[PDB]
Structures are given as C-alpha cells and as structure tokens.
Write a protein that binds this ligand. Structure first.
Ligand SMILES: *[C@@H]1O[C@H](CO)[C@@H](O)[C@H](O)[C@H]1NC(C)=O
Ligand SMILES: *[C@@H]1O[C@H](CO)[C@@H](O)[C@H](O)[C@H]1NC(C)=O
Ligand SMILES: *[C@@H]1O[C@H](CO)[C@@H](O)[C@H](O)[C@H]1NC(C)=O
Ligand SMILES: *[C@@H]1O[C@H](CO)[C@@H](O)[C@H](O)[C@H]1NC(C)=O
Ligand SMILES: *[C@@H]1O[C@H](CO)[C@@H](O)[C@H](O)[C@H]1NC(C)=O
Ligand SMILES: *[C@@H]1O[C@H](CO)[C@@H](O)[C@H](O)[C@H]1NC(C)=O
Ligand SMILES: *[C@@H]1O[C@H](CO)[C@@H](O)[C@H](O)[C@H]1NC(C)=O
Ligand SMILES: *[C@@H]1O[C@H](CO)[C@@H](O)[C@H](O)[C@H]1NC(C)=O
Ligand SMILES: *[C@@H]1O[C@H](CO)[C@@H](O)[C@H](O)[C@H]1NC(C)=O
Ligand SMILES: *[C@@H]1O[C@H](CO)[C@@H](O)[C@H](O)[C@H]1NC(C)=O
Ligand SMILES: *[C@@H]1O[C@H](CO)[C@@H](O)[C@H](O)[C@H]1NC(C)=O
Ligand SMILES: *[C@@H]1O[C@H](CO)[C@@H](O)[C@H](O)[C@H]1NC(C)=O
Ligand SMILES: *[C@@H]1O[C@H](CO)[C@@H](O)[C@H](O)[C@H]1NC(C)=O
Ligand SMILES: *[C@@H]1O[C@H](CO)[C@@H](O)[C@H](O)[C@H]1NC(C)=O
Ligand SMILES: *[C@@H]1O[C@H](CO)[C@@H](O)[C@H](O)[C@H]1NC(C)=O
Ligand SMILES: *[C@@H]1O[C@H](CO)[C@@H](O)[C@H](O)[C@H]1NC(C)=O
Lengths: 24, 556, 23, 818
C-alpha cells in the first residue's frame, strides 16, 4: 500500500496524507 | 459492368487482375492478404486494381497483411451484399499490422447482412470501429466484445487525440522559434480547471516532438502511402514546449507540426495541424553569367542573368565601373628591337521505452518503503565622377530596375582597362529598416569583378605639327614635331620614315625610343644631297599608330 | 493524483517533518 | 590457516538515519550494520563534523534518498569496504537517489559488492559516477545491475578531470579529482589491498598487515566467530548473516521486512528469519517443525505485483485468492536479477483461485518461477483465465515438466515479440475443454513471436560454385514432404505438400561480414531477397566482382504453419574480374626528349594490382596547312593490352617510335627518355591484377582480360632546343646585278619549314630591318635567294619558321653595295 497505491493510483486529501508525519 | 469473380489476392500482382471491375461476385469471400517485402507502393497498385468495384456479392476479408495503411483504397465501394465468412460475419478484419483506418471520411458502406469482426489490429483505434455502427442494416446499439476486440484493437495506435495550437515567436535568416500555446497539464494540477491536455502522472510525458520539412507548395500531408517515410526532420523530445529550428534556408516555405510523445502505456495524446512560414530574406546570390565586351573606344557593353534563387525580392541591380590605370612600359625591356602589335587580354525510428518505465516503477517502489503511515564596399549608390579634364569617366555607377539585364556606358577613357561590379539587392523588411541601425546590412550580394578593355581609338595615335629644317646651309637635316595630344598608354618609340624621290628607290625608316627629345624636342638626321620626303609616326604600348602627312626637303 | 516529484514536494510542504521507519 | 579480523567487531541492528542530524549518534561504535542502513530526508547535513571510520561493512544494502547539505559521501563512510547484500531492496544493494548537494562519493576503501548492484540517479551535482568500473566491484556472475543516469553529465560535469591516475578503457578511473581508483589482477578477485599487495582468500575487502607480518581480515568471506573466520559455524551456534550466535541469542535478533519486525529462529545451524517451506515455527518460537505434515498451507490475497520488492511479501503463500486477478507487471531495465527474487516471492504457491495476468512487463524471461503451480481455477477478466499482453521480454511459459490445469475460461495472448507460437501451443491440452486449436480471436499469429528466433530448426546451406559475377548455392539439409519418406536423420518434415512454399535466399554486400539479418519492419530491409524456390538450388547473378557478400536461407509455408527452418549467415567473396581504369592521368613535357606521366588509382582495383603498364607511341606531327598562306599570317606558337616489355628504336637511334615498360605496383610517376622532339605521343596507363589459379590451370589462352581498359592521353615535347635553324649562310653579289643570299635548310627541322625571313638592315645608326618573306617551296631552285638592294653597307640575318613557330636568327653577316 504505502504511498503510491494510496495517493498516486488514486487521489488523496490533506488528512489522508497527514498520517506520514511526525509533526504538523 | 463486369461482375468479376471473387478470390484471394495474395499479392499486388494478383490485384492487377481486378482492374476495371465494378461488381465483385462469387460465393467465396474476397480475401486481401498481401504482404510487402522489400518495397513500397502497395496503395497505388491495390487501388488501380479494386478502385472500380462498387458492390461485393459475398463477404470481404482482409488479414495477415503488412503495410496496408487503410481500407480506404476501395475508391467506389458502397455495398456489401454480405453472403458469408462464417454464417454470422460479413466483414472480417484480422491481424493487420499498421492498419489504422477504415473507409474515407465521406464514404459509407451498407453491410446488407451479418455483423463485423475485428481483432488483433494493433494500429486501429476501437473508436474508429464504431464509425461502422450506424451503417449496418441490423443497426445495433453497440458491438459485443465477441465481435470487436475492445482490449486488443489499437492498443498502441492511440487515437484520443486533441488538437494543439502552435505559433511562431520569431523568425530569421536561418532559424525560427516555435511555441506550443495549448498548455499541456504535466501532472494533475489539483487546484485548477481547464487544460484539457492533462497527463495523470508527470513521469508519463516524454516531451514535445517537432516535425518540419521544406515544402515550396505548402501542401505536404502528415502521413504517407508508403509505410516508411523520411521526408520529415524529427527533433529530439523536450518537455519545455519551446524549440528553435535552426540551419534553415532563407526565404523558403517551411511546413511543420508537433506531437506529444508519451510512454507506451499512456493513452492521451495530441497533435497540431500542419502550419507554414517563411524564413525571411537573406543575402541574394551573386549575379551569374556576367560578361563584358567592347563596343568602341569610349563605350562598353555589360550583360548578365540571374540563374539562381534570389533569397528575396529584387529591388534594383547596381552597376559600378572603376578606371584601373593602363599599363606602363617596363623600362628594362628594349624597343626598336622587339616591336609591339599588342595582342590584348580579355530509417528506423522505433522509440524505446524501457528506461523511463523502469525508472518510473523504481520511484514507486522506493517511496512505498521510505514513508510510514503514522576589400569590398557596403555603400552602393548612384554616382558619376567625370575626370578633371572632363573627357572621360574615371568612376561610373548607376541603379537599374530589376528587369534590365544589360547596360552600356559612354565617354570612357578610350584605350584602358575597367573593373566592374554587377550586384543585386533585395528589399528591406520592416524589422530591419525601422528597427536596426545602418550596420550589418548584408542585404546586397557579393560581386565578382570583371576586367575588360575598350577599343584603341578611332583615329589612333598621331604626331601633329611636323616640320623639317636644315640650318647653316653644312648642318644635317633635322625633323621637328609635337607628341600626341592624347596618346594611348604612352609612346615608346618614334619611327621617322623617309624616301628618295627617284625610280628604283624604296622608303627606309629610322627607329628611336620615346626619349632623346628633352633638349629642343627635335631630332637630326644626316643625309646627302637630293630630294627626299619624310613621314613620322608613333608607336605605343597599345600598338602601332598611323603616319602623318608627308613633308619634303631638297638637301645640298 | 500525486506521484513522484510532485508528491515529494507536497510532502515537503506538509508536516515539515516525517516519522522513523525502524526507531 | 585460522584468521583474525581487524578490530573487535561490534554489530548493531538495521538503522534508519532519519529527520535530523543528531540522529547520527546512534550510528556510533557500529563496526558492521547487521541489516540495512538508510539515510534519507535530511534537509541539511552540513553541521555534522564526525566521520565514522569504525563502520566497515553492511549486510543488506545502503540507500541515500533526499539528503542535502552533504557534498562528499565519504563524510559518513570512510571505510565502507564490502556490501554483503544478503537481502536486497528491489535487487539493489547501493542506492543514491534524488540528492542535489552530493558531488563526491569518496569510496576509496570499498572493494566488493557481493550481490545485486547499484543505482545512482537524480544527483545533478554528482560527478565521476560513470568513471568507476563497477564491473570490477560487483560479483563475477551476472553484473548488469548498473544504472548511472541523470547526474548532471550534460556539459557542466565534463570537468571530471580525475587526478591528472591510471587510464583504462579510454577513460580515467577515479572516485574524484584526487582519488584514483584501485584494481587488482584476477588472482585476487577485487579484494586486494592495492594493485599488488593481495591478502588471503579468507578475507573480504582486504586486511590489515600486522607489524609482525600477520594478516587481519577487514571482513570474513565466510561466517565469523570470536573475531576469527572459518568456513562454517561451530556446532551449537547458528549463523546470523555474518557470524555465529547461540540459539537464545539468535532468538533476540530481529530483522525488518516491508512492515514486519521478524525475529530469527535458530534451526539447522542457521538463524533464519522464518521457517523454510514445509515447516512451521513452534508456538514458543524456539525452532522449526514440519507442522502437521508436508501441507503447511498458507492463503494470501491477490494483487498487483508492480515491483520485485512488492513480490517478497508473497513468500510462503500456498494459495492465492481474491476476486481481483493477480497481475504481474514488474518492469526492469534488464532481467539481471528478477528471477532470483520472484522465485523466493512466489515459488511456494501451488493453486490460484483467481485468474493470472501478465502485461506491460519489462525484463521477464519466463514464468518458470511458478515452481509448484498446478491449477488456475479461472474464477473470472471474465471468460479469461490467463492474460498475457505486451511483454517485450517474455520468452517462454512454464518449464517443460510443469502442467497447469486451467479449470475454466480461455486464454489471451498478444504483443509478446519474443514468445514463440510453438510455446503457446503447449497449453492446448492444458485447458479444461482440451481444444485442438486456439480461437483466432484469443491468440494472435503475428502479435506473438514476430521478432524472436526461438525455435525452428537450423538449415545447412553450402556454396557450390562462384564466378566474377555470380554464385550458386545448395541446401544440404533434406526436406520431407507430407508423410515422411523415411523417419529420423534431420527430416525437417512438412506435413502437407501444399504447405511448403519453398526456400528463400538473401544476399547483400558486407565487407566486414557481420550484418545481422533482415528486419521485420519496412526500411533497413537492405537484403535483396530472392523469390521462393522449391528445388533448393539457387543462382545469384549480377554480382560485383571481388566483393564480400553475406547470405542466408530461410524457409516459409502457407498460413504461417509453425514448422519452419532457417540458416545462419555466411560469407563469400566473388572472383577478381577486371580492374578499373587508372584514375587522373596527366602528362607533362619535361624537355625536348622527356615526358613526365603522373597517375593515381583512386578506384576499386579488384584482386591485388600486380603490374602497372605504360606504353607510348609516336604520332606524326601535323604538316603543311597549305590552305593558308603563311607569309600573309604566320603561326607564331604551337598549341597542344596484350603486350610484353621493352621498346623500339628509330633507324638513326635518335628517338623511340614506340615505348612500353612494365612497372611494379608501387609506381605513381614515370618519365620517358630519348623521345622525339616536338611530336605528339599517345600514352597508356594500364593496371593489371593477379590471375586466379583456375584461369591458367583449367582455362585456355583466350579472353583473359587481366588488365584494365586503356584511355589515351596526348602530350607534345616542347619546342626542341633553341638551335636547329638555317645553316651555312653566305651572301655575295651575283655579278649592278641583284644581290643573292644562299644557305642550306636545317638537317633537323622543328617540323617542316614553311617560310624564311631574310631580315636585312642598313649599317647606319638607329636603323630597323625590312625583313622579306619567302614561302619556302621554291627557295633553293636558283641555289640562292636573289634580292634587289641599293648602294650601301648592310647586315643580313636569316631564320627559319615551322609549325612549331618562329625559329631564331643566325648570326649576322655583312655586304657592301656600290
Ligand atoms: C487554440 O485552440 C482552440 C481549440 O482548442 C481554438 O478554439 C483557438 O482558436 C486556438 N487559438 C489559437 C490562437 O490558436
Ligand atoms: C511562448 O514561449 C515563451 C517561452 O519560450 C513564453 O514566455 C511565452 O509565454 C509563450 N507564449 C505565450 C502566448 O504564452
Ligand atoms: C479557465 O480557468 C479559469 C480559472 O483559472 C476559469 O475562470 C475559466 O472559466 C476557465 N475556462 C473556461 C472556458 O471556463
Ligand atoms: C502541392 O501543390 C503542387 C502545385 O503547387 C503540386 O504539384 C503537388 O503535387 C502538391 N502536393 C500535394 C501533396 O498535394
Ligand atoms: C509561402 O508562405 C507565404 C506566407 O509566409 C505565402 O504567402 C505563400 O503563398 C507561400 N508560398 C506558396 C507557394 O503558396
Ligand atoms: C522594366 O520595368 C519597368 C517598370 O518597373 C518598365 O517601365 C520597363 O518598361 C521594363 N523594361 C523591360 C525591358 O521590361
Ligand atoms: C549591347 O548590349 C545590348 C543590351 O544592353 C544588346 O542588345 C546588344 O546586342 C549588345 N551588343 C553587343 C555588340 O554585344
Ligand atoms: C561507544 O560510544 C561512546 C560515545 O557515545 C564512547 O564513549 C565509547 O567508547 C564507544 N565504545 C566503543 C566500544 O567504541
Ligand atoms: C559535531 O557533530 C555532533 C554530531 O555528530 C554534534 O553533536 C556536535 O555538536 C558537533 N560539534 C560541533 C562543534 O558543532
Ligand atoms: C518430465 O521429466 C521426465 C524426467 O523426470 C522427462 O523424461 C519428461 O520428458 C519430462 N516431461 C516433459 C513434458 O518435458
Ligand atoms: C548440390 O546441388 C546439386 C544440384 O544443384 C546436386 O546435384 C548435389 O547433389 C547437391 N549436393 C549436396 C551435397 O547437397
Ligand atoms: C548440418 O551440418 C552439420 C555438419 O557440418 C551436421 O552435424 C548437422 O547435423 C547438420 N544439420 C542439419 C539440420 O542438416
Ligand atoms: C572476405 O572474405 C574472405 C574469405 O573468403 C576473408 O579472408 C576476408 O578477410 C574478407 N574481407 C574482409 C574485409 O573481412
Ligand atoms: C562490423 O564491423 C565493423 C568493423 O570492421 C563495424 O564498424 C560495424 O559496426 C560492424 N557491424 C555491426 C552490425 O556491428
Ligand atoms: C615529374 O617526374 C618526377 C620524377 O622524376 C615526379 O616526382 C613528379 O611527380 C613528376 N611531375 C609531373 C608533373 O609529372
Ligand atoms: C616496390 O615494390 C617492391 C615489391 O615488388 C618492394 O620490394 C619495393 O620496396 C617497392 N619500392 C617502393 C619505393 O615502393
């Protein structure tokens, strides 16, 4: 899954992408 | 009509047999299975063969063929009675490499009976198949997957094409710059709308490819009947959308168009229409065939023609003639011993995709693991320069309308050499005449000087004011005269001839160099008593001259 | 659809920092 | 002998240097990285000051991704000697990707990468990347895992001068401008200390030399124990990728999968991450057991296998299920390491509940890695169970002894350029319905295998006879038609007389004899393919003599019947023929008796030129244009094979009528001698070749034509010497009678004499002559030319005149008249 299957083969949002971080 | 028998066309040669046939008959299906080995011109032969046909009694089949660019060569086909090949099909198209289009845009075929069949046509769009949908007698709503290979037709002949605007930004003597103004959206932009030419993944776009070739007629077409064509010059792909065509021939009608190049797996593509432009004027070619000839002492004739392309519109021919000093006698060379009479001079392209695909997939593989989910003039102009003495022109120049191929001079410096230009000039473009200062002009051709001489003189050299004296009535007889008023070149020797007025006597003549006259401009000759006659003449580097009138003396 | 360099830039813009993979 | 390691090695588990520079602290004291080491996403690395000389080797791999503020990779890796690569990330051991500040690698001490390869990409400030011969660093087996692209090498990086350093392969080999790279001979296999100081085979990457002379390996080639190397671990200890540990110790060592934190299991002496096939771990996770029989099954979900690394997580799966078809789409720049990984990923599976799809693959050589697959179940991809589309590297399907039962649905095939249709047909008995042939709507005939040689059979073509313009070919291999006339012995049967169209022959000029083949696409089809012939006997005509042709024979049949044969290329050279005409002959007049001939041979000679040949013939000079009166207007100056050696000489032996000389093939210039003065000469310049032995041992004396055709060139000897004028002049009064002057004409005329000029002058000063013209002919009838002259003293001169032009006057003589 990782990233590309989440945000490359289909769109992502500013939350669906916010989980890959240590801070905000 | 002929109602020719149907059959299998295994080659172009067999296709020739069908020439002039308006109707094809025979229960077995007409078959087109022409290969093409080491050659071209499939289209012309086939159309010459089948162009006459307008109706097929049985079904049509075409498969296992190469180079058959299209099925449009049936230049008159409108009916297919559709007697099958299998009981269900009346048009059978299978495994046709590089086949890319069915009937022409303004042509329709009535499939009287049965359905169509299409599979494994790598260069034929599925959408082009549906153009046949309204033509069938059965009028189906769509083609079933069993009849049309939705995922096996045109899989690498993509035809989701959209048009691209192109515009020229600047042109020059040998180069031009091209834009693409329909903004392709490399990578989905995620905020905005518009930009219909959008690539879902930025890596999938290789770059724009520019095509251009010389076309005086401005009617060259994109494709070609031959399966191989190399008239287009194909540029390398870049993603900037800006190209600078260079090494162009000035003032030649170029034609160009652009296409977007993408990975083999990307379906979207785009192309522009063929556009035309000219490469601005350059330096006109030097005048050809120029030749000069003498007419008389003071008149010369020049003729020329323009046998090579002018690189622009001729505005005016320009002629210049400079006097070049006539020769001077070489003092180290003797005369009266070597007299002068003066003879006078004068392929596979097949883009490969492995590298970019591998890189694209490695990118995805990596990110899934890293992230975690919490000597010549330039000022030609009209000019006449009459010599100080005002008899002849030392420099003469004029402009001429471009249609005047010949010109003559007058009042030249009689016997002498002349060097002359014959140069063309073209019109000035606004970007030069109202945007550039008077340097770097280069708007006139180079010249090849032609050296030519005039005729000697109508009356030639002469020595006037002759008179002969005898002083002290013991001194030898002597001759007096004046040098020529306007001698050709310069006089080298004076040749005083004389005769004795007595039968059985013949004229005999002295010979002296032009010098030896500084003391009184007089020459003395010993002679015995008698009655004689004298007659002087001059010799010049231009040749011999004419005698004067005789004189007489009675010596004693 | 974010892929490759565009997604790398979006990640750089968002969260200003990332998390370990084997802390 | 027993061998030591340098330094007391300390291991540390796999590491991820992430986020901030201060996290480098955890890399302290790490002699060897137990797993993988990744350094990534450091926005600025400049502040770090400490190098890590202790770090010696890494087991799995190194990846550098999006690290900036770093200029020399040596800043972190002073002594990265060997990369063992027990586990590879997508088949790669060293990855340096998308880093803008990197310029120097500084891997001086690196010697060997044990598996996989290296990918260096997207480093615009990097240089020297292409200079190092990675082939010397990688393993002796397949090495193509080398991708060096997009590293600013356009123009700016061309300052990669390297020291001055050794130069090989038309390039310098250096890590950077001040670090020449190190090689060593084959006896060391790239673990030598320097070009010659090579250590024991027990070491990998090198060794330290003790002051006592003892060696100390930088790293053990085999496993290690108690800082000593040996072939294999001692009993009671289990290898853990670089050394031997106790079972209790191995139980604690972890390793990192895509997401799983696995722990080693000590079994059969190996600290394996998970139990092998046919085994299951005890619920206490202490050892491996055969589970409940050989069927230690495991089901897993289908998905998209976009890359090798994604395929790893399928390891140990015996059953694949899910409505989504399993699709293989791995695309690699080359299949150098794909099989080794895919086999580990999927070899365990034996049954698939869903369909199989393989499309858009690059670098797949075959589906062999489905080692235990036996059933597909064709659950769907509706109506299609197997799907193979657009694989420009796929070569063959399951191994010969494999058999997969497609329970439901058909199969699809398309755009598989190297997949041979013969291999496709092996699936016919494998379908549930067992049809005798595939539907024409499901498997193409030209879409598959149009570019791969694959099967067929070799055909023996032999050359029978040759000539200067033609050749003739046999095909020794037999051809059985319909029912085989006699089985065995290379029958190459066609099962139908209708099928066999015939043999097709190709030929084309190739001096080097290394052209490849006729391509499958228009253009570049330079072979002059002949028409098919049934007999197998073919003749080639209109050939250029003495040219190296290349030819091959290919069969063909109706409806592309798959039984066909083909032959490899061969070379032959036509016979010498006749050499071409000599090029650019020029003749110049050196003197009154010498002509200088210069020539060149800028043309194809054929054979080898063996003897140049020059021949010169005298051509009688023009004479007596009697239509023109020379006295009225005189001519002032003039204008313009089967043989054997040796020349001919004139009767008076003053000139050669005809001259012919053999020459060695060196010559480009020649000068004659004793040639007639002022006479046109016709000049040959002929070249000849060697004669083929047949032409004299089996041919009679006719035709031959071993010598080129001759083109004549003309020239004239220049004007003779100044002399050769009127001789023996004398003058006397005939007696009041007219004066008479008599002489004798020249014995050696410069061409026949046409006019005589009697130039006479008075002796008085400042005088000029009054020469008279005599039109020869009647000159000497009166034994002297009469002339009327009055009283006085005169000087007489005489000169001749010829077609060569004016002569020059004889010396003056005097006469007095009264
Ligand atoms: C640009 O293309 C659009 C169609 O996409 C067309 O309507 C428009 O006229 C074009 N404009 C120019 C300047 O070419
Ligand atoms: C044409 O291309 C130039 C760059 O080459 C760009 O600045 C300009 O905007 C383009 N034209 C238009 C209309 O945008
Ligand atoms: C183009 O995009 C702008 C906003 O960027 C939008 O307002 C406009 O409507 C779009 N074009 C058309 C034809 O709608
Ligand atoms: C283009 O026009 C010229 C005449 O101007 C004609 O001779 C030529 O055949 C045309 N070419 C095409 C491709 O239409
Ligand atoms: C060449 O292009 C110009 C415009 O750039 C056009 O006026 C001219 O007609 C073209 N040439 C021909 C032969 O049509
Ligand atoms: C040349 O053209 C001019 C007009 O430009 C015209 O007056 C003249 O008669 C022409 N001469 C010839 C010889 O065609
Ligand atoms: C002189 O030139 C004119 C054209 O200017 C030409 O008609 C005439 O024939 C020429 N005469 C000679 C003798 O060359
Ligand atoms: C481990 O690192 C520390 C510093 O953090 C150092 O004091 C110590 O000597 C190191 N131990 C070894 C064995 O290198
Ligand atoms: C040197 O680097 C270490 C981290 O490796 C850091 O903690 C230390 O502050 C640095 N020294 C200086 C003087 O900045
Ligand atoms: C299967 O293997 C045996 C040897 O074990 C061999 O004889 C046989 O030919 C193989 N079958 C196929 C189809 O290759
Ligand atoms: C070669 O071909 C000839 C006929 O052209 C035949 O007589 C001869 O037996 C053939 N030889 C071989 C070895 O095939
Ligand atoms: C081809 O000739 C070789 C000998 O040169 C022989 O060993 C081989 O069996 C032959 N093959 C065929 C197919 O005739
Ligand atoms: C041509 O073929 C002959 C063999 O007959 C070979 O000796 C020669 O080297 C070939 N020529 C070249 C240029 O390779
Ligand atoms: C054949 O060899 C020559 C060198 O003699 C080389 O230039 C040429 O590229 C070679 N041909 C091929 C197809 O590699
Ligand atoms: C003249 O002959 C000499 C040999 O003595 C030779 O070197 C030279 O090339 C010849 N030149 C010409 C013009 O024949
Ligand atoms: C001429 O050719 C012969 C061989 O026939 C050779 O020995 C000699 O060196 C050559 N001389 C020159 C000057 O080429």
């Amino acid at each position: 899954q990782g990233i590309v299957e989440r945000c490359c083969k289909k769109s992502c949002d500013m939350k669906a992408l916010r989980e890959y971080c240590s801070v905000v | 009509d002929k109602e020719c028998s149907s059959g299998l066309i295994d080659s172009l040669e067999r296709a020739r047999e069908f020439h002039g046939c308006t109707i094809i008959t025979g229960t077995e299906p007409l078959t087109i299975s022409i290969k093409r080995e080491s050659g071209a011109h499939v289209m012309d032969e086939l159309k010459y063969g089948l162009a006459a046909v307008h109706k097929i009694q049985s079904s049509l089949m075409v498969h296992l063929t190469y180079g058959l660019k299209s099925l449009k060569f049936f230049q008159s086909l409108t009916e297919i009675s559709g007697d099958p090949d299998a009981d269900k099909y009346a048009l059978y198209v299978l495994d046709n490499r590089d086949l890319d289009e069915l009937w022409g845009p303004n042509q329709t075929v009535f499939i009287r009976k049965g359905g169509v069949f299409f599979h494994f046509n790598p260069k034929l769009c599925v959408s082009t198949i549906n153009q046949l949908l309204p033509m069938l007698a059965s009028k189906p709503k769509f083609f079933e997957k069993s009849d049309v290979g939705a995922d096996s037709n045109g899989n690498r002949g993509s035809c989701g094409t959209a048009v691209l605007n192109v515009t020229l930004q600047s042109v020059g003597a040998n180069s031009a710059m091209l834009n693409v103004t329909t903004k392709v959206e490399i990578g989905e932009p995620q905020k905005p709308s518009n930009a219909t030419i959008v690539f879902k993944d930025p890596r999938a776009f290789i770059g724009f490819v520019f095509y251009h070739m010389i076309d005086p007629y401005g009617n060259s077409t994109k494709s070609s009947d031959d399966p191989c064509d190399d008239r287009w010059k194909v540029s390398s792909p870049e993603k900037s959308g800006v190209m600078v065509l260079s090494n162009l021939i000035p003032y030649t009608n170029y034609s160009y168009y652009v296409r977007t190049m993408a990975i083999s797996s990307e379906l979207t593509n785009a192309e522009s229409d063929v556009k035309n432009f000219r490469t601005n004027p350059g330096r006109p070619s030097k005048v050809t065939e120029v030749v000069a000839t003498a007419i008389s002492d003071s008149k010369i004739n020049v003729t020329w023609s323009y046998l090579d392309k002018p690189y622009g519109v001729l505005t005016r021919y320009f002629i210049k003639a400079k006097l070049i000093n006539r020769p001077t006698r070489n003092n180290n060379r003797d005369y009266c011993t070597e007299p002068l009479v003066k003879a006078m001079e004068n392929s596979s392209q097949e883009y490969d995709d492995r590298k970019v695909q591998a890189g694209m997939e490695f990118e995805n593989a990596l990110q899934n693991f890293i992230f975690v989910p919490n000597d010549d003039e330039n000022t030609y102009k009209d000019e006449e320069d009459l010599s100080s003495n005002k008899q002849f022109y030392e420099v003469f120049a004029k402009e001429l309308p471009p249609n005047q191929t010949h010109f003559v001079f007058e009042k030249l410096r009689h016997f002498t050499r002349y060097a002359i230009f014959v140069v063309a000039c073209r019109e000035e473009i606004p970007s030069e005449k109202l945007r550039d200062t008077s340097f770097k002009k280069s708007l006139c051709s180079d010249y090849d000087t032609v050296f030519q001489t005039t005729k000697r003189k109508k009356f030639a050299d002469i020595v006037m004011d002759l008179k002969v004296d005898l002083e002290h009535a013991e001194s030898p007889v002597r001759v007096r005269w004046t040098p020529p008023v306007d001698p050709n070149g310069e006089i080298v020797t004076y040749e005083v001839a004389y005769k004795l007025q007595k039968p059985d006597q013949v004229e005999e003549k002295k010979c002296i160099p032009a010098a030896d006259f500084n003391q009184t401009a007089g020459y003395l000759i010993k002679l015995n008593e008698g009655l004689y006659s004298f007659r002087v003449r001059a010799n010049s580097i231009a040749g011999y001259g004419d005698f004067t009138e005789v004189e007489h003396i009675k010596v004693e | 659809t974010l892929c490759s360099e565009k997604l790398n830039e979006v990640l750089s813009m968002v969260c200003e920092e990332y998390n370990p993979v084997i802390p």
